[PDB]
Amino acid sequence: GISVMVSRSNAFLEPFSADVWVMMFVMLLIVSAVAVFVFEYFSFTIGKAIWLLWGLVFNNSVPVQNPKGTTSKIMVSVWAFFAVIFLASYTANLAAFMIQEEYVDQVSGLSDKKFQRPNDFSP
Amino acid sequence: STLTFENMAGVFMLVAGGIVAGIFLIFIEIAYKR
């Protein structure tokens, strides 16, 4: 027939999809309400307690207060290991997309605009 | 011819299960305090 020969060429949400990012948004409201509701009964909160429970999502060494309570911090310990298994899952799938990497290519055939455009199409 | 909730779907039930189980242990501390 007739073909064209070319050389070979040399996005955080691109791995996975938009399906995941609509979930932890719920956890943002849920975890914030849980801590205040537990603290409200026994009797911070919006001002400061929101920092720790969102900060727990990220394994960072930021110096922050540690709320006391024999049972108050029991659930946050349960809430603690949800993130590590989440992030380990959240990074394992990333390597899969490098396995599933595609070739971007440049043209689609003789009928492409680039071939049909002598000038006015960059260099 | 990109996972789904899958394991996280049961996590939320465990997350919700912890919330209802939280009030169970709330009275336990009160029980020993009295």
Taking CA atoms, what residue in A is nearest to B23?
A38
For residue B11, give the nearest of A21, A74, A50, A78 by alpha carbon: A78
How far is residue A123 CA from its own chain's centroid?
38
**Closest Cα to residue A27, out of B14, B15, B5?**
B15
Burial of B30 (0-12, 13-18, 19+ CB in 10 A): exposed
Q: A18 in contact with B at a CB cutoff of 8 Å?
A: no
End-to-end CA distance of chain A: 29
Q: What are phi and psi of B29, to 5 degrees?
A: -65, -40
Q: What is the CA radius of gyration of chain B?
A: 16
**What percent of the residues of chain B are helix, what percent strand, and what percent coil, each to the nearest 5?**
80, 0, 20
> Cβ(A103)–Cβ(A8) under 8 Å?
no
The answer to whether the CB of A107 falls within 8 A of the CB of A114 is yes
B18 touches chain A (CB under 8 A): yes
Residue A38 contacts B where some CB pair is shorter than 8 Å: yes
Query: A1 is written with which tokens?
Result: 């027939």
The CB-based long-range contact list for A85-89 (8 Å cut-off, 24+ gap) reads A85/B11, A86/B8, A87/A59, A89/B3, A89/B7
Closest Cβ opposite residue B29 in set A16, A71, A93: A71
Which residues lie closer than 8 Å to A37 by C-beta, 6 or more apart? none
Q: Which two tokens stand for residue A85?
A: 């298994």
- Experimentally determined by: cryo-EM
**Spatial distance between the Cα atoms of B30 and A81, rounded to a whole number of angstroms:** 27
What is the spatial distance between Cα A5 and Cα B11, in angstroms, rounded to a whole number? 52
CB distance from B2 to chain A under 8 Å?
A: yes
Question: Does B18 sit within 8 Å of A75, measured CB to CB?
Answer: yes
Give, as one character, the DSSP assignment of residue A20. Answer: G
Cross-chain Cβ contact A75/B5 below 8 Å: no
Contact status, residue A24 vs residue B12, Cβ threshold 8 Å: no
CB A39 within 8 A of CB A49: yes
The whole-angstrom separation of Cα B10 and Cα A82 is 11
